[PDB]
Every structure is written in C-alpha cells, then in structure tokens.
Design a protein around this nucleic acid. Sequence first.
RNA 1: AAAGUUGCUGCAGUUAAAAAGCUCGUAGUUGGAUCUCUCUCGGCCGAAGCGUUUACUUUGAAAAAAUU
Lengths: 149, 82, 30, 129, 186
Amino acid sequence: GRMHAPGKGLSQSALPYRRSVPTWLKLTSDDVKEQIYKLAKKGLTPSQIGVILRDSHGVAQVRFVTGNKILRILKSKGLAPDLPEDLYHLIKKAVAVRKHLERNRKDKDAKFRLILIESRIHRLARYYKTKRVLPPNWKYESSTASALV
Amino acid sequence: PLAKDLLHPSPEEEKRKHKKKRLVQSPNSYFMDVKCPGCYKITTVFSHAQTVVLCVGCSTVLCQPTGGKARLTEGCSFRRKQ
Amino acid sequence: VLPKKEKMKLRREQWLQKIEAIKLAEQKHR
Amino acid sequence: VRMNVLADALKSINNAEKRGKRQVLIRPCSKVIVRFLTVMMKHGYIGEFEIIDDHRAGKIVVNLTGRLNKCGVISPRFDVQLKDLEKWQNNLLPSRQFGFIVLTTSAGIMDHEEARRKHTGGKILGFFF
Amino acid sequence: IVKPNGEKPDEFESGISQALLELEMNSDLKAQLRELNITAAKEIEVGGGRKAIIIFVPVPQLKSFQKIQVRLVRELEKKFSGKHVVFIAQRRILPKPTRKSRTKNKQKRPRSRTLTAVHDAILEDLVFPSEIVGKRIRVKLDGSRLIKVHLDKAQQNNVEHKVETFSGVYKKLTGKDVNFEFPEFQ
RNA sequence: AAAGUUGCUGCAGUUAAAAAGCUCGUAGUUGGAUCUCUCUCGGCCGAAGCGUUUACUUUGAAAAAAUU
C-alpha cells in the first residue's frame, strides 16, 4: 500500500539476476563517467541521467558498470546538488499548487493536496536531518519556497 | 490439483506470470540495435524507452515513447540483442 | 441445533483421541 | 507492514498443511527461518526443503509430509530461563510426548529437550506438534 | 611472473612461470602478460584420478586476466597433458569480529572481506566463460547443504566437461558440495 | 474459587454492552533480508589492555528462624 494513498499497485522494475555487464556493451567505466559529467553540466538530476544513459547509451545499470551509483559519482566530482532531488521536486510542486491557490481561492481540493505535499516534505526533511544530508537548522516555510527552485 | 512442483515451473507458465511474481524475478524488456534507413550507423535503444532517441549524424527520430514499448519509426530496422 | 458445551466437549474429546492415535502410531514405529 | 518473517513463514506452512498441499513456497527467507525449518526437519515434520536464491531476500520451497499438526510462533520473544521452560511447555504443547518449543539460546537455535540437555535457556521462537 | 605473498617459490609455480614465459616469447599474448603477474599455485586430484591446476592471481589484476582467459587456458592445455586449468583470485577472509579478538579492529571490515562474499566471488571466478544465472541450496535430511548452480545455456559447450573439476576444486577449497546444471530456457 | 464476568497466560465490539465523517498529524509501541584475543616483565603460565557498549542466558559466592 501507499504511504498516504489507499492504493496498492505492483508496477515497478525487476532487476535481473545477472549483475555482470553484458558482452555487447563497448562503453568503459570512464566513458560512462564523462557522460554522467556532461549530462550533469546540462542541468539534470540523477533520474534523467540514468534514464538517458539507459535509453540511448545502452548502459542498463550504472552501478553494474562503474561499480558505483550515480549520486556518489556526482558527489565525488562535486557536481552534486545541495538538496536531494525528491525533496526539490516536492517543494516545486508545493510552489505550483500555492500559485494556483493564489489564482483560485475556492479550489479546496488543492488545499487538501497542499497539506498532503507539505506532510511529505516534513517527513522527508526529518529523514534527511536524521542522516545529516541536510543541516540541522533546515526548515520548510511557505514564503521560503520559491527561493529554493 | 494440490500437487505441482514449484521449483521447476514450465517455461510458458513462467513467461505468463507477472515479472515480480516469478520464481526469480526478471524483466520483460530488452536492448535492441536500430539502423536508420537514411544511414548505416547502429544505435542501442531500450525497448521501453521514455526518451525520444535521435540519430547521432542523421538526427532523425528513431523511437517515440508510448505507454509501453517505444514506437520505432516506419523504415528503421532493428535486432534484439543477446 | 445443540448447545455449545457438548460441542466443545466433542471437539476436545476428538482431539484427545487424535492425540492418542498419533502417540500410538509413533510408538508402533519402535 | 511485514514484521516477524518467521510468523509469516509458519502461518504459510500451517495454512498449506491444513489444505493437504505437497509443497509450499515461503518468502522472504531468513537465517532464523532456515534454522527453525532445520530443527523441524530433523525430527521428521517437513521432509526436505530447497532455498531459491535471488539477489534479494530469498525464497524457500518446503516439501510438506503430513505429520505436522501445528507450527506456531510466539511473539514477542520472551526470555525463557531454564526453570520456567517447564511452565512454557505446560502452556504450549497439549501433550507430553510430541511438540516442540524452539529456543534461540547462545548455543544456537534448538528444541527444548536439547536446551535442557545443554543446560541453558534463551528466548522463545515457536513450537510445533 | 610469480610474486608469492609468502615469497617461497616451489617447483610447480616456477614451472608454470616458465610455461607462461615460453607462452610469451612465442604466442601473440605479448603486450599484456608483462604487465601482469601471479601469486601462487596448487595441483589437486579431482573426479577420481583427474588432476587439475589452480593459479591464485592477485585481485586488482584479475579483470585483466579476464581479457586473456580463454587463450591462456587453451595454450596451457596444449602445453600440459590432459588437465584442467582454473584461475581463482586470492581473496582474504577477515575473521568475524567478536568480543574476544586482537586490538587491530579499529575500523569496520568491508562486506567484501566476509566469508560469504568471498565464497560467492570464488564461485563466480571459478567459472569464468560461463555466467552464473541461478543458485539453489538443497538442504538434505542429514542437515548437509548442497549448492546447485545454474550456468549459461548459450556458452554451455565450452565447459561441459569441466563441471566435475569445478565441483572438486570448490569442495577441496571450501568444503561445500556444488553441482552444476544448465537450464533449458532463461 | 467455579469465572475466560477484568482476560499477560486468556474476553469481547455486523445484527446482543461496544469501532470514531474522512485524511493529515508529536511522543510512545513495533519494525524486511545481509557480516563464520593478544602485548610486555617474573615461574608451557602468571599479571596488563581487554574485544564497541548493552539487553538476554548460565555458573559461583552470599542470602533469620518459625511457616511451607
């Protein structure tokens, strides 16, 4: 089941038992890393980095080829964002919903969804302050939302 | 009824089952080589690609993303790998 | 149909008979 | 959510055995489940089982026999001192020939007879008669 | 060519060192073998009187040994008599940290230094040309385990006759019985 | 005490006593799989650091009679 929603879907990805890099892939670990670096220079979060690398460059799992995952590769190079991508997406969604609320006041559906999104923001922020990815003085506030995008 | 070996399922039964619900899970997707009719270069594309894939030199559209597998352009050729 | 007292008495006594049958079956194997 | 994977394994085995099935597939696997099933196996209750390995928590196919009446878990894992063990079997096993409290002691996972033979106590996991 | 950790060359590994040198001064395996080196070697009777050669190589060069594995195997089989040659990386087993140990454990041991990870790596390196696609553990009535290993159907014909040598080598090096199979479909 | 009518062992809550409009929402409670003894000084040993620290289990010492 979902964390707030009552649904229970099964749609996900099934990784294979072969952790081995396939024979047909001619890219080396380094070339994967410069592809990662240039896509990070284009302004892409690790999700679209992995999606483009899987879709066009033929690397199924970066962790299988380079031996390390994408966020650690960007963290060693230092091209790693100050917020994790999911929290950033949640905050962007909260800004968009709040802008719609300012345009449209009676849309109480968006008010309930806004409360839901901020609840997800607060739980994820508690997690990130737990493992020191965020500084312990971090706080989410309504008017301090458009500055983080 | 009440008696079938779970360790050795028949391959059509394993193919029919959901990818997570198999004995050991395995994906339904694959990587394939695509050749544009306007050139000779081969490109590796994921079957369920979500991004539109362009040719390196021709810059033609190779696949369009859809709900499931990607729609390859009429004219391109492809071959499944491994 | 019938009161529950003798229903649980029947279930307990049939379980006792089941236990004794299993015990004597395991005793016969020696 | 899923807590106490041994509870799930034993409930699945129990529900399969009451329908008279020949094999049961239990997931996820665990070292505690494998030790419990090995103790259950060595007394002649579940035949012989095979672990299926993915790169996740694995699965087990258990080839049921027909001897099992009930396998059960005791949650939470109460501390069992060597004296109070007698009380526990007077609580759990309905008969004094067959049935087994499975204990996790520092000498391993074993049954209550062997736990008395090793002169030790520990925490309780289950029972099977 | 041989750089033992104990620095004690015996006649077997010096002999196969000379074999690798003669391989280098004739065959095309030239530009890569100089950069490489091995660590130790052993010879084990398996399968009822069939000998087999084991060469322990250092770990960080092992990937390079993957690039020339098949050519090295066939050249040493041409050089030797009817034998079987396997390359197994020399992995270090760190003991399990308990409440009674030496005061050297000022840092947590990596998971790759454990028993199970090392034995998994040994099993996947003993079969280089084929890839392990499955693993089952059959636990017998006596309580003794038996690992059943599923390899590639695609490149089956390369190692059809070496599965008994593989089983004997793994049993002698570890103590665990291993059987090898080939599934009909993946 | 019968008594499982106070329920840890061991009760209940559709229609009989009883589960709330619905979601979000501290604390608390609970939480997937995984990791197999040595260094010095004195006679093979004694002293010393113990090994991350606990919870758990066991042993030994010690623990009024009367009552049971």
